[PDB]
Amino acid sequence: QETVVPSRVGDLKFESDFPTQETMKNMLNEMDFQRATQAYLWGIPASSIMEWLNVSRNDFKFEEGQMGFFNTLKQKQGIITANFTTPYVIGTWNLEKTGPLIINLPEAKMAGMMLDVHQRVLSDLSLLGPDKGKGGKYLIVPPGEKYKDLNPKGYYVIRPKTNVVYGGIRILEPDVDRVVKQVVPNITTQPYADGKLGRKIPVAQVPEIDWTHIPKDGLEYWKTIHQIIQENPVEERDRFVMAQLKFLGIEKGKPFNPTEEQKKILLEASKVGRAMAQSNDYTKRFTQPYWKGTNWKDAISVSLDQRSENYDELDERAAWFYEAITVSRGMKSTIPGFGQRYLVTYQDSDGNWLSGEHTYKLHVPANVPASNFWSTTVYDENNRLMIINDAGSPDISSRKNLKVNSDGSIDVYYGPKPVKGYENNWVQTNPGEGWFTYFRFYGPTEKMFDKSWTMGDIELV
Amino acid sequence: QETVVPSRVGDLKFESDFPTQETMKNMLNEMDFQRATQAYLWGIPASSIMEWLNVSRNDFKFEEGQMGFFNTLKQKQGIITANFTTPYVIGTWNLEKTGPLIINLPEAKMAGMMLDVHQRVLSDLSLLGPDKGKGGKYLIVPPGEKYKDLNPKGYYVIRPKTNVVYGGIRILEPDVDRVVKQVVPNITTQPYADGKLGRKIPVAQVPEIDWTHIPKDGLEYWKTIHQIIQENPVEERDRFVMAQLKFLGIEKGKPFNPTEEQKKILLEASKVGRAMAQSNDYTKRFTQPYWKGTNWKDAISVSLDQRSENYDELDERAAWFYEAITVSRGMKSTIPGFGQRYLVTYQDSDGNWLSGEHTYKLHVPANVPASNFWSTTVYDENNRLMIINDAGSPDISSRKNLKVNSDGSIDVYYGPKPVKGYENNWVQTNPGEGWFTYFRFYGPTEKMFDKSWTMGDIELV
């Protein structure tokens, strides 16, 4: 006799207790689908780094191990939630391909960090790093056994657990001429070559190409997940994910030739996975509102090493890295007047998504708890890149000569059209396109940490 | 504006690119459901062990650390795919509760192993173990840092990575009185602690209770998953699983108080999860048929440490441990005339599920490649336990005086009624109830390994 049991994944049919052949087929298909969807979330951080390396390696065609200078708005346009005022020197490469690589940093006012492929922090650089801004040499060693004993004097020896790494530096030097003439030209990477040293590799200028490192979609996302796996060793915490991807046609050491059945599952996994990525990020259920009764929340939910007490931070890293790149102790400051602190919001005071055809207003209270300055940068929901508008500016910074109210407060208006009388306090948005903003505190003070100083939701006008 | 995108998990709606509040709720619910279902498969091995300990601890009420003698059919009835021929001495306990524990084994003909909670092998015991059947003392040390330097002389020091362990021994001694009067009475466990040595704990007789250790269903399965997590430390390979269970109401160090919404998801995960477990086990897509054109396959698809080259055996262990308990190098013999080898089949020559109302015939060729003997044991699909029939026998062993054909072959019959002339060559099945069988080779020979000797599928008569 046959028996049927309804389920949210369809009717489950059994014959003589055994599941029917069709039911087994549906269950294995559902099994693979769920696994692919969950793996999509697992791979968000690495996908971002992988795709940046792909752009560096194949579009800019920088040498493997070479860094680039991302200075103009257009050069930085492809950087997820990029900072509008700071220039970047960034590079990514595969250590198995380059061998031990040195990063020669000059004495300069910079702040940065080196990350592994999943974006865990390996070391801070410059001001917040070992060299403390005085300059020095960092030796990045491949995780292979061949280099297990390499530990030469005169270098800050860094040992990632993966082959694909990322080095990012924010240039804080205020003198632009000094940045272009003395700082960047004195930054180089260089093969270690048994200690003999290879030729120094200069920082290259980012060419005039329309690029971005955000994770791709459809099967392209999976081709890159496959690449990540081929270019890196398998780590203990990821071994069950590898087991779950095997039957989807993704294994280390084998080409990616998905069957039509696997493609169908993977394409659907990208679709649902993306929606689940958005939902996880924008809901941020692991983070309470920063200020009671507001939509503002601490934007960086992931820790430097992605380790919570009893679990690794799959959801927090999936959230932050879906909309941002890099993390560091400096970006999550708890020291007054040090580093930065990020607050993000995607909704207005009514709880509705911020959309570019509407006009909004953010009332910024007087005495903003930032020792340096503050800013509100607008990003598009879809690609999470600096918003592209006719005005040509996605940000409003306190360093600008803004119109300040009598009480010392400042109103920022975004909107598709400028608000009369506040033309220099607006960002300009695009009709029908969703947006969100990062309110950055440069040098957060005690009043920002203890929440004595507060600020309300962005309001629909 | 609103856009709608269909998916296998429902219509996905977006407003100004952002997913609608409803869609976010749906995706998070789907996310949790997929994670619970995948976690169900992940916890199959541990659930079996934990439930056995629950029976020992709360039903038999054996002392924590005490072993039991599972000798009669009824005592062994609750053992998944139990051996009908050999008696068992089995014990399971929590090392954090017992502290270091010694296993005193006498010189005897026994074959067994020590497993961790996920059923990975820690050490062989007796014949295939360090003592080689001559007897010895095995010191099981808790994984806590507190005992990191414990390594006393005169003991085989065993170091599991988890707290819940399982010790299993098959008694091979042919002399029954010997077994009951000399073997079992000389097996004991004994607390260590600092080296003072506690009182030896004798092996207890399994009481008259109808018990079983198969994983439970509904919310009971989850209460046990939660228990497994509380009783053991969190290992690196399971840290993403812990991250995925957090929002289902399951965390280490916290009670299990699932909300109604979480219960609803978990109940459906147990339902779908079980169907997925059956499908994965009976399909065994990671194992090819042992003999071409037949449904027979090597039964044990998991390795001793669950480690494949680039992934941990999530599916292999979910299959084997769904229908069986324990594993060891002896059960996967590759040495002529040594240990055993299991072949399993769930279907007849037509590919149809084996069901008890039908009559089947298995033609066993002459010169079975087993140095000791061979057997075919029938188990019910639902509980995966020795089949319960009116005859009172779930198997056919070559040690029995079977009717042998003139060519040396032997025909085994399966059915609700005996086949005229082969009354002593049958096992009796139950109408409408599916079954499967393990063909065991005791002392497999080179002829079994190289496949020169073959045997066809079970045929529907």
PDB file of N, CA, C and O in Angstrom, chain B residues 367-400:
ATOM      1  N   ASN B 367      30.600 -22.269  -3.147  1.00  0.00           N
ATOM      2  CA  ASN B 367      31.898 -21.718  -2.785  1.00  0.00           C
ATOM      3  C   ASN B 367      31.831 -20.256  -2.349  1.00  0.00           C
ATOM      4  O   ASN B 367      32.635 -19.431  -2.795  1.00  0.00           O
ATOM      5  N   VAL B 368      30.875 -19.937  -1.480  1.00  0.00           N
ATOM      6  CA  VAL B 368      30.742 -18.570  -0.982  1.00  0.00           C
ATOM      7  C   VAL B 368      32.113 -18.164  -0.453  1.00  0.00           C
ATOM      8  O   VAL B 368      32.705 -18.870   0.358  1.00  0.00           O
ATOM      9  N   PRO B 369      32.637 -17.018  -0.911  1.00  0.00           N
ATOM     10  CA  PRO B 369      33.947 -16.515  -0.494  1.00  0.00           C
ATOM     11  C   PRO B 369      34.035 -16.015   0.951  1.00  0.00           C
ATOM     12  O   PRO B 369      34.381 -14.859   1.200  1.00  0.00           O
ATOM     13  N   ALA B 370      33.712 -16.896   1.895  1.00  0.00           N
ATOM     14  CA  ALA B 370      33.778 -16.579   3.321  1.00  0.00           C
ATOM     15  C   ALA B 370      34.471 -17.751   4.013  1.00  0.00           C
ATOM     16  O   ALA B 370      33.991 -18.884   3.953  1.00  0.00           O
ATOM     17  N   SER B 371      35.595 -17.481   4.668  1.00  0.00           N
ATOM     18  CA  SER B 371      36.348 -18.541   5.335  1.00  0.00           C
ATOM     19  C   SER B 371      35.616 -19.129   6.536  1.00  0.00           C
ATOM     20  O   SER B 371      35.727 -20.321   6.814  1.00  0.00           O
ATOM     21  N   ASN B 372      34.861 -18.293   7.238  1.00  0.00           N
ATOM     22  CA  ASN B 372      34.127 -18.741   8.412  1.00  0.00           C
ATOM     23  C   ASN B 372      32.712 -19.183   8.043  1.00  0.00           C
ATOM     24  O   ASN B 372      32.394 -20.369   8.104  1.00  0.00           O
ATOM     25  N   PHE B 373      31.861 -18.231   7.669  1.00  0.00           N
ATOM     26  CA  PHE B 373      30.490 -18.549   7.279  1.00  0.00           C
ATOM     27  C   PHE B 373      29.774 -17.309   6.744  1.00  0.00           C
ATOM     28  O   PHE B 373      30.309 -16.202   6.810  1.00  0.00           O
ATOM     29  N   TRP B 374      28.577 -17.498   6.196  1.00  0.00           N
ATOM     30  CA  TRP B 374      27.811 -16.378   5.655  1.00  0.00           C
ATOM     31  C   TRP B 374      26.392 -16.360   6.199  1.00  0.00           C
ATOM     32  O   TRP B 374      25.875 -17.379   6.660  1.00  0.00           O
ATOM     33  N   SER B 375      25.757 -15.193   6.145  1.00  0.00           N
ATOM     34  CA  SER B 375      24.394 -15.076   6.626  1.00  0.00           C
ATOM     35  C   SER B 375      23.640 -13.950   5.942  1.00  0.00           C
ATOM     36  O   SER B 375      24.238 -13.018   5.405  1.00  0.00           O
ATOM     37  N   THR B 376      22.320 -14.068   5.939  1.00  0.00           N
ATOM     38  CA  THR B 376      21.452 -13.046   5.381  1.00  0.00           C
ATOM     39  C   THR B 376      20.437 -12.740   6.468  1.00  0.00           C
ATOM     40  O   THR B 376      19.637 -13.595   6.850  1.00  0.00           O
ATOM     41  N   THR B 377      20.492 -11.521   6.985  1.00  0.00           N
ATOM     42  CA  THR B 377      19.590 -11.107   8.045  1.00  0.00           C
ATOM     43  C   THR B 377      18.603 -10.089   7.503  1.00  0.00           C
ATOM     44  O   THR B 377      18.983  -9.146   6.809  1.00  0.00           O
ATOM     45  N   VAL B 378      17.330 -10.294   7.815  1.00  0.00           N
ATOM     46  CA  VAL B 378      16.275  -9.406   7.356  1.00  0.00           C
ATOM     47  C   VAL B 378      15.916  -8.382   8.428  1.00  0.00           C
ATOM     48  O   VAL B 378      15.726  -8.727   9.594  1.00  0.00           O
ATOM     49  N   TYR B 379      15.822  -7.125   8.009  1.00  0.00           N
ATOM     50  CA  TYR B 379      15.504  -6.007   8.895  1.00  0.00           C
ATOM     51  C   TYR B 379      14.313  -5.230   8.335  1.00  0.00           C
ATOM     52  O   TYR B 379      14.141  -5.155   7.121  1.00  0.00           O
ATOM     53  N   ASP B 380      13.492  -4.647   9.208  1.00  0.00           N
ATOM     54  CA  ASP B 380      12.354  -3.877   8.724  1.00  0.00           C
ATOM     55  C   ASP B 380      12.821  -2.478   8.323  1.00  0.00           C
ATOM     56  O   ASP B 380      13.651  -1.875   8.995  1.00  0.00           O
ATOM     57  N   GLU B 381      12.288  -1.978   7.214  1.00  0.00           N
ATOM     58  CA  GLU B 381      12.652  -0.658   6.706  1.00  0.00           C
ATOM     59  C   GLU B 381      12.384   0.476   7.693  1.00  0.00           C
ATOM     60  O   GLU B 381      13.230   1.347   7.876  1.00  0.00           O
ATOM     61  N   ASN B 382      11.216   0.462   8.330  1.00  0.00           N
ATOM     62  CA  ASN B 382      10.840   1.536   9.250  1.00  0.00           C
ATOM     63  C   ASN B 382      11.783   1.767  10.431  1.00  0.00           C
ATOM     64  O   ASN B 382      12.302   2.871  10.595  1.00  0.00           O
ATOM     65  N   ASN B 383      12.002   0.739  11.248  1.00  0.00           N
ATOM     66  CA  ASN B 383      12.871   0.860  12.421  1.00  0.00           C
ATOM     67  C   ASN B 383      14.294   0.365  12.192  1.00  0.00           C
ATOM     68  O   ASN B 383      15.176   0.601  13.020  1.00  0.00           O
ATOM     69  N   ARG B 384      14.516  -0.321  11.075  1.00  0.00           N
ATOM     70  CA  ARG B 384      15.832  -0.866  10.763  1.00  0.00           C
ATOM     71  C   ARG B 384      16.327  -1.815  11.862  1.00  0.00           C
ATOM     72  O   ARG B 384      17.511  -1.839  12.186  1.00  0.00           O
ATOM     73  N   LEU B 385      15.409  -2.599  12.422  1.00  0.00           N
ATOM     74  CA  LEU B 385      15.744  -3.561  13.471  1.00  0.00           C
ATOM     75  C   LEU B 385      15.521  -4.966  12.927  1.00  0.00           C
ATOM     76  O   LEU B 385      14.883  -5.128  11.888  1.00  0.00           O
ATOM     77  N   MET B 386      16.048  -5.974  13.618  1.00  0.00           N
ATOM     78  CA  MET B 386      15.848  -7.357  13.175  1.00  0.00           C
ATOM     79  C   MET B 386      14.346  -7.540  13.005  1.00  0.00           C
ATOM     80  O   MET B 386      13.565  -7.191  13.892  1.00  0.00           O
ATOM     81  N   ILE B 387      13.937  -8.076  11.862  1.00  0.00           N
ATOM     82  CA  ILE B 387      12.519  -8.261  11.604  1.00  0.00           C
ATOM     83  C   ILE B 387      11.856  -9.135  12.669  1.00  0.00           C
ATOM     84  O   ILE B 387      12.447 -10.099  13.163  1.00  0.00           O
ATOM     85  N   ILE B 388      10.635  -8.764  13.034  1.00  0.00           N
ATOM     86  CA  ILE B 388       9.856  -9.497  14.025  1.00  0.00           C
ATOM     87  C   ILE B 388       8.826 -10.330  13.275  1.00  0.00           C
ATOM     88  O   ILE B 388       7.929  -9.782  12.631  1.00  0.00           O
ATOM     89  N   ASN B 389       8.958 -11.651  13.347  1.00  0.00           N
ATOM     90  CA  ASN B 389       8.020 -12.539  12.667  1.00  0.00           C
ATOM     91  C   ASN B 389       7.496 -13.630  13.595  1.00  0.00           C
ATOM     92  O   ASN B 389       8.009 -13.822  14.699  1.00  0.00           O
ATOM     93  N   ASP B 390       6.469 -14.345  13.140  1.00  0.00           N
ATOM     94  CA  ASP B 390       5.888 -15.421  13.935  1.00  0.00           C
ATOM     95  C   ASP B 390       6.902 -16.535  14.165  1.00  0.00           C
ATOM     96  O   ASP B 390       6.930 -17.150  15.230  1.00  0.00           O
ATOM     97  N   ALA B 391       7.737 -16.794  13.164  1.00  0.00           N
ATOM     98  CA  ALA B 391       8.745 -17.839  13.266  1.00  0.00           C
ATOM     99  C   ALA B 391       9.727 -17.543  14.395  1.00  0.00           C
ATOM    100  O   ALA B 391      10.196 -18.453  15.080  1.00  0.00           O
ATOM    101  N   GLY B 392      10.036 -16.265  14.588  1.00  0.00           N
ATOM    102  CA  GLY B 392      10.963 -15.888  15.637  1.00  0.00           C
ATOM    103  C   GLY B 392      12.413 -15.870  15.188  1.00  0.00           C
ATOM    104  O   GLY B 392      13.322 -15.810  16.017  1.00  0.00           O
ATOM    105  N   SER B 393      12.641 -15.934  13.880  1.00  0.00           N
ATOM    106  CA  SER B 393      14.002 -15.904  13.355  1.00  0.00           C
ATOM    107  C   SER B 393      14.093 -14.910  12.211  1.00  0.00           C
ATOM    108  O   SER B 393      13.353 -15.003  11.237  1.00  0.00           O
ATOM    109  N   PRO B 394      15.012 -13.940  12.315  1.00  0.00           N
ATOM    110  CA  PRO B 394      15.185 -12.927  11.275  1.00  0.00           C
ATOM    111  C   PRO B 394      16.289 -13.248  10.282  1.00  0.00           C
ATOM    112  O   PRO B 394      16.572 -12.448   9.392  1.00  0.00           O
ATOM    113  N   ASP B 395      16.923 -14.408  10.416  1.00  0.00           N
ATOM    114  CA  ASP B 395      18.003 -14.715   9.493  1.00  0.00           C
ATOM    115  C   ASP B 395      18.172 -16.159   9.056  1.00  0.00           C
ATOM    116  O   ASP B 395      17.515 -17.071   9.555  1.00  0.00           O
ATOM    117  N   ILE B 396      19.082 -16.330   8.106  1.00  0.00           N
ATOM    118  CA  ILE B 396      19.452 -17.628   7.569  1.00  0.00           C
ATOM    119  C   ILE B 396      20.977 -17.627   7.539  1.00  0.00           C
ATOM    120  O   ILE B 396      21.599 -16.813   6.851  1.00  0.00           O
ATOM    121  N   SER B 397      21.567 -18.529   8.314  1.00  0.00           N
ATOM    122  CA  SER B 397      23.016 -18.654   8.419  1.00  0.00           C
ATOM    123  C   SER B 397      23.511 -19.949   7.784  1.00  0.00           C
ATOM    124  O   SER B 397      22.812 -20.962   7.808  1.00  0.00           O
ATOM    125  N   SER B 398      24.718 -19.921   7.226  1.00  0.00           N
ATOM    126  CA  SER B 398      25.278 -21.108   6.598  1.00  0.00           C
ATOM    127  C   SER B 398      25.651 -22.131   7.666  1.00  0.00           C
ATOM    128  O   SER B 398      25.920 -23.290   7.357  1.00  0.00           O
ATOM    129  N   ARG B 399      25.663 -21.694   8.921  1.00  0.00           N
ATOM    130  CA  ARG B 399      25.986 -22.586  10.030  1.00  0.00           C
ATOM    131  C   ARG B 399      24.798 -23.487  10.339  1.00  0.00           C
ATOM    132  O   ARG B 399      24.916 -24.455  11.087  1.00  0.00           O
ATOM    133  N   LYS B 400      23.648 -23.151   9.764  1.00  0.00           N
ATOM    134  CA  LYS B 400      22.441 -23.945   9.948  1.00  0.00           C
ATOM    135  C   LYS B 400      22.499 -25.085   8.937  1.00  0.00           C
ATOM    136  O   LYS B 400      23.196 -24.986   7.929  1.00  0.00           O
TER     137      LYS B 400
END
